[PDB]
Amino acid sequence: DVRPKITLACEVCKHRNYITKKNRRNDPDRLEIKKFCPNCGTHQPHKES
Amino acid sequence: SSSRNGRDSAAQRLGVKRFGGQVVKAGEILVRQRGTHFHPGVNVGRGGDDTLFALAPGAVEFGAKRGRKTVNIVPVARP
Amino acid sequence: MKTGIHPEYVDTTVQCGCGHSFTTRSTKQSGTIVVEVCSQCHPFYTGK
Amino acid sequence: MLIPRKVKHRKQHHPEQRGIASGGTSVSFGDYGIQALEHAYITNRQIESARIAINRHIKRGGKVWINIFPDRPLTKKPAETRMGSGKGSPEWWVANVKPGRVLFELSYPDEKTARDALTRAIHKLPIKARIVTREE
Amino acid sequence: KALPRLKQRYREEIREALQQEFNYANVMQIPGVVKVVVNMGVGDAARDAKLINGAINDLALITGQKPEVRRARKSIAQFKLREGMPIGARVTLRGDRMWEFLDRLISIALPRIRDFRGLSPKQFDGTGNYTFGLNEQSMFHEIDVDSIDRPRGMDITVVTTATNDAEGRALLRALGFPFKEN
RNA sequence: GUUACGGCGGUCCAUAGCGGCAGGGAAACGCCCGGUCCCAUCCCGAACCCGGAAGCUAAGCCUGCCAGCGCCGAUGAUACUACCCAUCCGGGUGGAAAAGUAGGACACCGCCGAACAC
RNA sequence: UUGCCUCCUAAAAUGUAACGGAGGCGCCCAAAGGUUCCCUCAACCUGGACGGCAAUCAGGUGUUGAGUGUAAGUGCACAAGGGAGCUUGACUGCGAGACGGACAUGUCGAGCAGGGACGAAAGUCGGGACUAGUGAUCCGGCACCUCUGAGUGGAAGGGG
RNA sequence: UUUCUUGCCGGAGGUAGAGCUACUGGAUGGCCGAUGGGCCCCACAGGGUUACUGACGUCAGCCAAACUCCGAAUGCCGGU
């Protein structure tokens, strides 16, 4: 808790591509951030699961 | 009646690994250090943890620039 | 000079009580102000 | 007594009693002085005793300088305790004195009285010490 | 074309008067007033941060351009200050607007001051700049007295190319500043 | 080829800095005037742009001289020390430290552009 | 007290023990990460109603002081420090070469995909100023896969 | 002979030594001169008056293992 190990999954390939920490208190909403989906072969928006 | 001390981290085995004049390969670690006690000179890069490594093959040299010690690599003439 | 973040600044004319005119830019949008004493009539400047 | 207002480290290694003094080896303040001839941890109690002896011998006039300051803490563990379980608490305040170090200086009109007072101090001290003079 | 009253007076007469009084080896030494900085330090913003907005509005209406909000570079607990708390407002006036603000401040505001007996000419920087403080903020017609909120001791300062107190006072007297000669 | 004219670049980056005294504008480096023109102020044409020569070397720039502050700084000696000799002392061979005075120094070169006479 | 990090001890490479001397920890940061650009006061005076040991402030020098996510060596007005824009180097996914340190740990050049900044100008910059901020294997999950599928036309029942 | 010994050459150190106005913690003097208490002139303007608590600063002097403006000897890493 406090800084959970959130999992960033892509919007298109819908693959859980990354795992990173986030302070739930400072950023309570799902972390939407641009990342690289290897399945898609390009940068796609990823958001927290 | 006891001592509050007794802890200590592992020695990180820092310092110069290739001294002046040593012929090194590209990517060879030259100095393990905390911070830039030596700065990356010529053909020498600086690692994330301040590890100075050779960018090109050659002989290690230690110079001084703007009063800062630097580690350079001098190319070695082909035989 | 920035476009619109800067507040308006228009030239204005003022007349004092003793009857001295004055022209200068000021934030007042009306452009006509009535000053009472002014420095052309203030006792400190005039004398004493 | 002489005790430091504070010390950055209160449990220090014993001062190394080696070599002759490199500084403070001449009378720089008074006319006469007490020069050490052996290494010793001269404690603040010994300094107090020596200076009181000098002052009480010279009585009314005269000036006394104490060049050494006991700012080195020698620790002592509690009595009847075995080896280990940490380092003892600070017990004595000592000045690391080496041969050639001038410990006390005295200005007094009467040479005989000055020398007798310095002799008092030397007898209070734990080392061999001689009476040196500014006149070289 | 257009030229402020005080700016034209400076360009036409003041330079010659100052040259004659303090004869300089070169024309470039002629003191020339430089940016005028007007400030409102709240201080009580720690208790009522809302006062910053009023200070901003008042400074805008007085000067003619937005006041930059200055936070705190320090956090002293004695006055309940933390790093970043908006603690004042600052306006820097340069050029035509600077000269026009000086002209208005000398021709309108200071005469309107209540029981105005002038300020002693001792507040000069010692290097050529003059700082003082207005006791209120209603003297300016832009700050209508009928819709004021509170009193803000208004800091003002004029920066000059003068070298010291003497040249600074000569310049400001030439510009026509009131002075409580003493 | 030369100039107290310029920029660009120069060293185990102060022997170069700081400070004091004296000097220069043909062209450069500057100083400077108003916002029709890109651009910018957490506000401000102060920093960045436009048209410039009506005017100026005050400052920056650079030149010469001052060793006052800083900087460098020997030789010698000592401290220290590797090895060796030495019953407790101490000594030999080799290496060898800041301060100061003796002192050094108010820095040290190439590319190109301007005028000068050829 | 037990693991990790920092210092001293530690005897100028590295390493070095003690129930030796001191501390930290084991987090935190989606804007404290990336990039691009820019900066600039440590304290006396005059002062700046209130607002002195402090304001918003203005000048000079203090010549690199000063201070600066969390203790040593570093980083400065060549800024690792302080502000700003981008929109997400928040640079991620495939990573010869070398290496430093038994396993474990740690460093990066560089090549490719995709992007982020800066663009004119270059083509340049692989989490945090760096070292702690962690726990092997087993066993289990959970998503995806061009794997398997206990006769199979085939699927269900394990692996990567 | 890559090992080792010796000579020479290149190299990074922060120990021994010191040095500290070069930093972080100290030391007898007087000093333009901080609260200045204290006599007060009798200003609540403003000012000498400081016998004594003595600011910064300054003067030769001194220490440190967790100090370093410095800094060996050895040792170590390479080359010859």
Swiss-Prot record, chain B:
Q: Which superkingdom? A: Bacteria
One GO cellular component this record assigns the protein to is: cytosolic large ribosomal subunit
Q: Does the keyword Ribosomal protein apply?
A: yes
UniProt keywords (A-Z) are: Ribonucleoprotein, Ribosomal protein
Query: What Pfam families has UniProt attached to this entry?
Result: Ribosomal_L27
- Single GO MF annotation: structural constituent of ribosome
Record-level GO BP terms: translation
Q: Does the keyword Manganese apply?
A: no
* Cross-referenced SUPFAM superfamilies: Ribosomal L27 protein-like
The text of the family note is: Belongs to the bacterial ribosomal protein bL27 family.
* Listed PANTHER family: LARGE RIBOSOMAL SUBUNIT PROTEIN BL27M, RIBOSOMAL PROTEIN L27
Query: What is this protein's name?
Result: Large ribosomal subunit protein bL27
State the organism named in the record.
Mycolicibacterium smegmatis (strain ATCC 700084 / mc(2)155) (Mycobacterium smegmatis)
UniProtKB/Swiss-Prot annotation, chain C:
What is the disulfide pattern of this chain?
Answer: none
A GO BP entry: translation
One GO MF annotation is:
metal ion binding
Instruction: Name the residues that bind Zn(2+).
Output: C16, C18, C38, C41
Presence of the UniProt keyword RNA-binding in the record: yes
| Entry keyword Zinc | yes
The record's free-text note on cofactor binding = Binds 1 zinc ion per subunit.
Q: Which domain of life is it from?
A: Bacteria
Which keywords does the record carry?
Answer: Metal-binding, Ribonucleoprotein, Ribosomal protein, RNA-binding, rRNA-binding, Zinc
| GO CC list | ribonucleoprotein complex; ribosome
- What cofactors are annotated for this protein? Zn(2+)
Q: Tell me the function of this protein.
A: Binds the 23S rRNA.
Quaternary structure and partners? Part of the 50S ribosomal subunit.
The record's similarity note reads: Belongs to the bacterial ribosomal protein bL31 family. Type A subfamily.
What name appears for this protein in its UniProt entry? Large ribosomal subunit protein bL31
Say which species the protein is native to: Mycolicibacterium smegmatis (strain ATCC 700084 / mc(2)155) (Mycobacterium smegmatis)
* Lineage of origin: Bacteria, Bacillati, Actinomycetota, Actinomycetes, Mycobacteriales
Swiss-Prot record, chain D:
Q: Does the keyword Hydrolase apply?
A: no
Q: Which GO terms describe its cellular component?
A: cytosolic large ribosomal subunit
Question: What family does this chain come from, according to its entry?
Answer: Belongs to the universal ribosomal protein uL16 family.
Q: Which UniProt keywords apply?
A: Ribonucleoprotein, Ribosomal protein, RNA-binding, rRNA-binding, tRNA-binding
Q: Name one GO biological process term.
A: translation
Q: Which InterPro entries match?
A: Ribosomal_uL16 (IPR047873), Ribosomal_uL16_bact-type (IPR000114), Ribosomal_uL16_CS (IPR020798), Ribosomal_uL16_dom (IPR016180), Ribosomal_uL16_sf (IPR036920)
What protein is this chain from?
A: Large ribosomal subunit protein uL16
What does the UniProt record say this protein does? Binds 23S rRNA and is also seen to make contacts with the A and possibly P site tRNAs.
What is the superkingdom listed in this entry's lineage?
Answer: Bacteria
In the UniProt record, the signal sequence range is none
For whether the record's keyword set contains RNA-binding, the answer is yes
Q: Where is this region: Disordered?
A: 1-24
User: Gene symbol?
Assistant: rplP
The entry lists its GO molecular-function terms as:
rRNA binding; structural constituent of ribosome; tRNA binding
Curated annotation (Swiss-Prot), chain E:
- Give the family this protein belongs to, as stated in its UniProt record: Belongs to the universal ribosomal protein uL5 family.
Q: What is this protein called?
A: Large ribosomal subunit protein uL5
Can you name the source organism? Mycolicibacterium smegmatis (strain ATCC 700084 / mc(2)155)
NCBIfam families in UniProt: PRK00010.1
UniProt keyword RNA-binding present: yes
Q: Which GO terms describe its biological process?
A: translation
The protein's GO terms of the molecular function aspect are:
rRNA binding; structural constituent of ribosome; tRNA binding
Tell me how this protein assembles.
Answer: Part of the 50S ribosomal subunit; part of the 5S rRNA/L5/L18/L25 subcomplex. Contacts the 5S rRNA and the P site tRNA. Forms a bridge to the 30S subunit in the 70S ribosome.
Which Gene Ontology terms of cellular component type are present? ribonucleoprotein complex; ribosome
* Keyword tRNA-binding annotated: yes
